[PDB]
């Protein structure tokens, strides 16, 4: 099986509460695919049930497993029962996708779902916009209304403000500092975000991440992948890269393996060997 497969399998084991082997067996018992099983296991996780129960629930409701997953997540973030989540998508004339975006918005922004709705209407904004504001608020330690105003008074789009907020949060700075850092280094806010994630995952500063990526002769995208890989692999950036070379795999591959080994509780060499065995 491919490393992507191994990852799906591992994540499904983890969320199921099973051995990898047993995850396979469960996929057999339900006659479901592995992607299927994963989505179903997350559904069970978020909604408080066993995977078998979530399967039975999907059948009984007559809905797909993706849909059950969205419902489950909505219930989770809104702090409701699965049925209650349905009743709430009714009392609002709202699509379940929309309800999920809304519930996550309420969650990040510390409101009720009904409040978050009312707020989207007050500000004159779309639900997904509300979500971005809620996450930016969350990462930057402000309110949704303040974040709204802030996107305005920095002369930025909500998307850009979100990116900046995540960046500030990961690098441990103010939003304003974040942007000045991006200008200093002569870089994009997107680039700044990736840099701050890399820095976070490898235990360095942003300016250090910038220099590191240069002094390894790689792209910042590549550094990010490497640092995530090393973070999950329990190693350093350099060890992680030597390892990618040692197994003859790309860095993306190594990241996926490292995640898989993490979720299934094995080393990375083992996880590799397992993919090959399967």
């Amino acid at each position: 099986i491919s490393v992507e497969e191994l990852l799906k399998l591992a994540k499904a084991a983890y969320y199921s509460g099973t051995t990898v082997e047993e995850a396979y067996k469960l996929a057999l018992k339900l006659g479901i695919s592995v992607e299927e099983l994963l989505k179903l296991a997350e559904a069970a996780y978020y909604s408080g049930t066993t995977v078998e129960e979530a399967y039975k629930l999907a059948l009984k409701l007559g809905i797909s497993v993706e849909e059950l997953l969205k419902l489950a997540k909505a219930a989770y973030y809104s702090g409701t029962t699965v049925e209650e989540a349905y009743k709430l998508a009714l009392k609002l004339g709202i699509s379940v996708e929309e309800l999920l975006k809304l519930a996550k918005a309420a969650y990040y922004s510390g409101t009720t779902v009904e409040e978050a709705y009312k707020l989207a209407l007050k500000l004159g904004i779309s639900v997904e916009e509300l979500l971005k504001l809620a996450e930016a608020a969350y990462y930057s330690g402000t309110t949704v209304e303040e974040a709204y105003k802030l996107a305005l008074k920095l002369g930025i789009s909500v998307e850009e403000l979100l990116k900046l907020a995540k960046a500030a949060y990961y690098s441990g700075t103010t939003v304003e500092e974040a942007y000045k850092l991006a200008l200093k280094l002569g870089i994009s806010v997107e680039e700044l975000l990736k840099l701050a994630k890399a820095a976070y995952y490898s235990g360095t500063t942003v300016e250090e991440a910038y220099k590191l990526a240069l002094k390894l002769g790689i792209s910042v995208e590549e550094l990010l992948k490497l640092a995530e890989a090393a973070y999950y692999s329990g190693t350093t950036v350099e060890e992680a890269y030597k390892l990618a070379l040692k197994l003859g795999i790309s860095v993306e591959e190594l990241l996926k393996l490292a995640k898989a080994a993490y979720y299934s509780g094995t080393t990375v060499e083992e996880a590799y060997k397992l993919a090959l065995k399967l």
Side-chain angles (χ1 to χ4, degrees), residues 1-10 12-18 20-24 26-27 30-31 33-34 36-38 40-50 53-55 57-58 61-86 88-89 92-100 102-103 105-113 115-117 119-120 123-152 154-155 157-162 164-165 167-173 175 177-179 181-183 185-186 188-193 195-196 198-214 216-224 226-241 243-245 247-255 257-258 260-276 278:
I1 72 168
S2 77
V3 166
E4 180 67 47
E5 255 320 277
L6 183 53
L7 178 55
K8 292 281 181 228
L9 196 70
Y14 185 86
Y15 282 88
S16 288
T18 72
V20 155
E21 225 43 45
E22 280 180 344
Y24 259 137
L26 177 59
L30 315 180
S33 89
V34 150
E36 206 59 3
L37 170 59
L38 165 64
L40 193 67
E42 294 181 56
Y45 171 73
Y46 286 114
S47 64
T49 74
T50 82
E53 261 161 14
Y55 185 72
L57 179 56
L61 289 197
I63 65 178
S64 66
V65 174
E66 180 64 41
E67 189 63 355
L68 182 56
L69 172 59
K70 299 169 126 42
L71 193 57
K73 270 149 89 170
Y76 187 69
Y77 286 112
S78 49
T80 70
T81 81
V82 158
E83 304 294 333
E84 253 159 16
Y86 262 144
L88 188 64
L92 293 176
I94 277 308
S95 91
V96 156
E97 171 67 340
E98 199 73 344
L99 183 59
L100 175 55
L102 197 51
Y107 183 68
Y108 279 116
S109 82
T111 71
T112 68
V113 176
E115 273 177 80
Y117 192 61
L119 177 55
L123 289 176
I125 59 172
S126 76
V127 167
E128 203 239 355
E129 192 77 352
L130 180 67
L131 179 53
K132 283 141 155 22
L133 285 170
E135 298 191 14
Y138 179 62
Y139 290 120
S140 60
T142 68
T143 71
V144 182
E145 293 93 312
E146 276 160 28
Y148 183 82
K149 285 148 174 184
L150 185 58
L152 298 168
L154 291 182
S157 87
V158 166
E159 181 69 33
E160 197 74 339
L161 180 55
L162 172 56
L164 261 169
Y169 171 86
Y170 277 118
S171 42
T173 64
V175 166
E177 271 139 3
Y179 184 80
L181 173 56
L183 277 198
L185 295 176
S188 137
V189 172
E190 231 279 329
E191 192 81 329
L192 174 66
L193 177 56
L195 263 186
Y200 172 81
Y201 281 135
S202 60
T204 70
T205 66
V206 178
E207 296 94 311
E208 256 154 45
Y210 184 85
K211 290 166 179 175
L212 182 58
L214 296 162
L216 290 173
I218 55 176
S219 87
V220 168
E221 182 62 10
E222 195 70 348
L223 177 62
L224 170 55
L226 248 185
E228 289 201 51
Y231 184 88
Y232 282 99
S233 177
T235 72
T236 76
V237 170
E238 300 73 20
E239 265 147 356
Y241 190 87
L243 181 46
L245 290 179
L247 320 174
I249 57 185
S250 76
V251 163
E252 176 70 353
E253 193 83 332
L254 171 68
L255 168 65
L257 269 183
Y262 169 63
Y263 281 111
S264 59
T266 68
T267 64
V268 169
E269 293 81 357
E270 268 163 10
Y272 181 78
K273 290 197 178 123
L274 174 61
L276 290 177
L278 304 167

